[PDB]
Amino acid sequence: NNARLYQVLRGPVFSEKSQMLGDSLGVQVFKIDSKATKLEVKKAVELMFEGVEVLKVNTLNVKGKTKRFGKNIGRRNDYKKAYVTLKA
Amino acid sequence: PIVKAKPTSPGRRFVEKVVHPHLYKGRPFAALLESKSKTGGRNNNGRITTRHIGGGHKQHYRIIDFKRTKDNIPATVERIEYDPNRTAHIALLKYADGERRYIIAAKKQAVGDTVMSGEASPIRPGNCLPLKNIPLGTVIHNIELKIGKGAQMARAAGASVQLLGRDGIYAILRLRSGETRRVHVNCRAVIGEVSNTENNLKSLGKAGASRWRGIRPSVRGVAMNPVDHPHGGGEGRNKGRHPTSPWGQKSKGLKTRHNKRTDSMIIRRAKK
Amino acid sequence: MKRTFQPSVIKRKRTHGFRARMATKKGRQVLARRRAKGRHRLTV
RNA sequence: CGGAAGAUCAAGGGUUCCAGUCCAACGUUAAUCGGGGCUGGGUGAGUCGACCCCUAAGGCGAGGCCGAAAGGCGUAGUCGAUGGGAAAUUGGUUAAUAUUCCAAUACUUGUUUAUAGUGCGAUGGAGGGACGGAGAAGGUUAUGUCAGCCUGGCGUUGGUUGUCCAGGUGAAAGGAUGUAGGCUUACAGUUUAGGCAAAUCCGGACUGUAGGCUGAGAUCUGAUAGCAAGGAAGUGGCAAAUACCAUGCUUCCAGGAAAAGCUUCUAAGGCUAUAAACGAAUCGUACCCUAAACCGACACAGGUGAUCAGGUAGAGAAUACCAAGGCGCUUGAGAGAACUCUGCUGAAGGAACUAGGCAAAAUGGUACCGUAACUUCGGGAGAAGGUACGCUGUUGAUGGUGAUAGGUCUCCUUGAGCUUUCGACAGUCGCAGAUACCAGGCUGCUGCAACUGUUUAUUAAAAACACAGCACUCUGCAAACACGAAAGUGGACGUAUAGGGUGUGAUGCCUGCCCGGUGCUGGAAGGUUAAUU
């Protein structure tokens, strides 16, 4: 439907990899739902940034790090991020 | 025949192998084959229920027609093959209608001859006949015990039975064990003696030749401790006890036959 | 020298795992006993 | 160090990976450093692997069988990889990912639409997939080495513009082609005791007519890529794998997975070509992995499967020195006693040591000569014991590859260049030429066990166990025997030339007497004898 595509993109990634990729290949890096396929991401980007056409989507699951605090051992959420290529 | 090996190695000094240059050097007929994995002499409980089994060479099962229910249809011996599942050789049959089967091979049976099954069949090695259509005194093998069940007795290399006579609806036979036996006259048998008559004549030569056949070493009971065998125990060498199996059963003459329903099918045995 | 543990994940989950416990009457008694003690680790 | 202490993984671990920052604790010392603390970043796939389809051992197992209960077994099935089943390589790029990103060039498999032609369809039938050990002769390549070519250099000390020195320099998958090899008569027709029914498909029986499949590598294309000093080269010889041809070939017995994918046939009742567009999900991907990250409580001298495999010598994956790459093993500084450990050398003697030549010393290579008792004729045997070995020059013989010519991935003769293996003669230097590392000590008598093997993980490796062979005995098949409570199993889809138990233990010569005891086998005249009545 069109009420599940609003929850596919969790937020853009701001890093040296994401900033270097944009300037050279114009590929947006996003943090996506833990259940979003490559098709859902493709259908979420083009609906929600009108005027762009996605060539490909490269997804990956990256695991959260164990960051201990105080007396406890705790881990960060795992998350999924996608590289999406837009038509030049 | 037998061929002694030259003593080029200590393991080859007493290797006397049986050699048959007339048996197929190719592969068995594919469709009459079945996968068959070793059991290590273990039952469905995973327990060793027969010792000294384990190892050996992988081998297929050849489906031997022990029944021979293709009567009045002639079959020609296509080839005589070696069988790893038994000591006897096996003849690849080629029935008129093209159906191919394996049977135990008679000693006097070559490639090209025709074999017959049924009641109106010639008395020649290979043919399968009911015991009433076989004249007395001929040498037979592949003896049936139940009607229609297939050959049970005299199926090993060199096996043969003497059809001594008839006393009604039974057929008096003299088995190679020396036991005279009556069998229903409607049961079938094959004419001739079983091939590979020089099998007992061989010599393995080395411990590894018995390992190739799936046989594991056997430890004498007097080489054990008393917690493992009744023969176990002793300072030095000693027997001390009457000979007995590891389960406590005499092994020097104790007769072990429990059947009381087949007791009337046995005429006598032989004393020597 | 070779030591006693020598881990294997498929072998661990197949002899001590959750589904291995639940496939026997006595394995379910193991799980019930871990739960009654309040253990945070039921199965390996 | 360099058959790793270098690289790629699997397992296992799980962020240890990269950067910035800090030095309390941790690191056997210090620490500004770290696999430590803290804060950020990092793992990109239709083609790699998993998942998926298929099955092995082995599980579970509608109904079924068995069992006080719990449960045990088992059919159809359904799971279960360590195996079978589709497909890409080169190069660049990040601090950290790369067959994933980017560039170039490919490949595999689907969906939808259209144009034609048109009998399609299986969980079933038949093919196929599909397989053992050893060995041998080749043909190759990866790779190496020299040469060519390009770019630099003219050398702190005699000489070095040359036949000099250094560095660099060889593009793959794929597509054409079809070679060295390997296999191999083809078609048509008639018909049918068979493949559980059916079948045009297989199998079987008859009648006429007379190169193909596979396949390394080379070649062409791919191919004006990329790659250094700021805009260069990029092609010839020789050598050569354990990798490929090759799941081949030849042999032997110990006789060599299964199932599916795939090709065909029909049973009940859409398919094949042509393209055009579109797609190929999800999970893993960092990093260690002969280890400081795994198993050993430790940053522990242990253990840990697979893959890659440079040079000079060398038979070699031994050994020595090096390459690429990676390290100096997380306390140092002194001194240079006894004593301890690990080594080197040792006058004269040479086992006098000692329980005992324990340890040490010694031998050690290749070729040729020569070699005893005894023997099962194989052996013993490398018995024992000798001689030669470096370098330089000349010279004889020889295998391979083959440019140039003479008579189309071709054939024949000649043979340049390179290379192989053997000799002879002459000279020459040293104490010493198998110069280093590496690398048998050998004999005589005698007990034991035939031998190869096995064993007390962690004080015993042996004469102990096993062993081929021998004997006795049991067992006629629902076999004896064994597991089990039984069902169900093994024995065995075996059948007395078989299977079990027991003893002995190759082989040669052999294996005497005793049946009183205790077993075992056979017999029943008599005596005694249970429940029961």
Side-chain angles (χ1 to χ4, degrees):
Chain A
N1 60 5
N2 208 350
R4 156 70 194 166
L5 283 178
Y6 302 131
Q7 282 288 333
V8 176
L9 301 199
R10 305 319 287 155
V13 180
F14 298 123
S15 325
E16 267 94 24
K17 182 141 197 190
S18 72
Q19 180 51 81
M20 162 256 266
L21 281 182
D23 303 331
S24 99
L25 317 150
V27 303
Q28 313 303 130
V29 189
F30 296 106
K31 219 159 293 193
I32 59 156
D33 208 67
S34 220
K35 279 292 125 193
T37 48
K38 281 177 194 213
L39 185 57
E40 289 170 14
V41 160
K42 164 167 207 119
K43 299 212 316 303
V45 171
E46 312 182 79
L47 154 81
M48 291 252 290
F49 301 79
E50 289 88 4
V52 313
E53 320 177 39
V54 162
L55 281 316
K56 65 214 299 300
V57 178
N58 288 130
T59 55
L60 67 157
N61 302 275
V62 53
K63 330 326 199 253
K65 284 184 289 178
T66 86
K67 296 256 162 171
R68 78 169 317 290
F69 176 83
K71 187 155 293 197
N72 66 38
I73 299 304
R75 71 161 28 260
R76 302 291 184 57
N77 293 346
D78 298 350
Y79 65 103
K80 204 181 188 185
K81 93 174 134 176
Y83 304 91
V84 298
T85 311
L86 305 181
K87 288 230 325 173
Chain B
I2 313 286
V3 281
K4 277 171 42 150
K6 302 291 186 68
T8 64
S9 302
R12 293 274 300 185
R13 183 183 292 280
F14 310 99
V15 166
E16 303 182 358
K17 64 168 95 166
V18 315
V19 171
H20 297 109
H22 76 98
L23 80 84
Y24 203 40
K25 290 183 177 186
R27 304 286 317 143
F29 193 66
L32 265 72
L33 285 189
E34 287 217 354
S35 165
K36 193 203 56 149
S37 53
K38 324 280 211 181
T39 48
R42 288 148 163 79
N43 74 344
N44 53 358
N45 281 335
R47 297 284 185 85
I48 302 164
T49 63
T50 282
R51 304 178 305 169
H52 318 142
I53 303 190
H57 196 290
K58 183 196 286 181
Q59 53 203 7
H60 298 290
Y61 187 73
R62 282 79 160 149
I63 293 168
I64 309 307
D65 166 50
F66 287 117
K67 284 200 186 172
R68 288 277 283 281
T69 62
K70 266 194 101 66
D71 302 347
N72 310 125
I73 297 164
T76 173
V77 168
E78 213 171 18
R79 63 197 185 222
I80 293 169
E81 300 212 16
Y82 155 88
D83 200 337
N85 294 266
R86 63 207 66 252
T87 49
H89 307 164
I90 52 164
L92 184 56
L93 287 197
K94 182 181 171 63
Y95 285 75
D97 51 31
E99 161 170 320
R100 290 184 176 87
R101 298 174 160 192
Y102 280 127
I103 59 175
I104 300 318
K107 197 214 172 113
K108 211 119 64 183
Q109 165 157 75
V111 163
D113 72 27
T114 84
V115 307
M116 270 294 341
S117 179
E119 295 71 5
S121 312
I123 311 279
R124 292 144 65 170
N127 305 321
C128 181
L129 283 173
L131 282 168
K132 63 175 312 283
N133 302 321
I134 291 166
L136 321 179
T138 88
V139 190
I140 47 178
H141 67 273
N142 274 354
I143 313 282
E144 274 194 350
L145 283 180
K146 320 251 182 87
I147 293 90
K149 194 197 175 156
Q152 301 248 89
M153 321 204 143
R155 319 197 326 189
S160 49
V161 184
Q162 330 180 225
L163 177 70
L164 289 183
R166 189 182 322 184
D167 64 354
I169 60 168
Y170 298 116
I172 297 165
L173 310 164
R174 207 217 290 300
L175 310 178
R176 272 290 303 264
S177 59
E179 182 213 82
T180 311
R181 192 193 204 289
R182 78 185 56 151
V183 176
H184 205 274
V185 65
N186 283 137
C187 288
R188 297 169 103 81
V190 186
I191 289 92
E193 66 249 41
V194 168
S195 65
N196 195 11
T197 309
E198 74 289 359
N199 178 19
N200 67 337
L201 270 178
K202 83 200 172 315
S203 183
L204 270 52
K206 70 170 182 175
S210 187
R211 295 313 296 280
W212 299 333
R213 302 177 155 69
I215 300 162
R216 302 205 64 252
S218 177
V219 164
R220 325 179 320 276
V222 281
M224 286 166 191
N225 285 300
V227 71
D228 307 312
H229 205 280
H231 291 173
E235 294 309 315
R237 282 169 191 142
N238 191 239
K239 277 141 177 173
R241 299 72 143 70
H242 293 109
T244 183
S245 59
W247 304 278
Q249 172 187 9
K250 310 273 167 55
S251 42
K252 283 290 149 63
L254 182 68
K255 307 172 96 146
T256 66
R257 179 185 160 80
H258 325 318
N259 280 358
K260 290 205 287 184
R261 34 164 269 268
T262 66
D263 258 20
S264 89
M265 284 312 135
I266 293 146
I267 324 303
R268 71 201 147 250
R269 301 144 183 99
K271 303 285 98 175
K272 273 186 289 182
Chain C
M1 314 99 69
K2 198 193 268 299
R3 284 300 161 203
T4 317
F5 178 39
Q6 313 309 330
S8 175
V9 174
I10 198 156
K11 264 158 76 164
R12 182 170 188 88
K13 306 282 191 34
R14 213 175 259 182
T15 181
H16 311 305
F18 186 82
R19 281 178 72 66
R21 297 296 191 205
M22 284 279 300
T24 38
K25 176 175 225 62
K26 306 295 177 176
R28 283 151 182 249
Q29 296 178 358
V30 167
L31 302 181
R33 203 181 325 143
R34 317 276 290 172
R35 276 171 178 135
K37 208 171 182 177
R39 285 212 183 252
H40 303 181
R41 194 279 278 161
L42 283 182
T43 59
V44 304

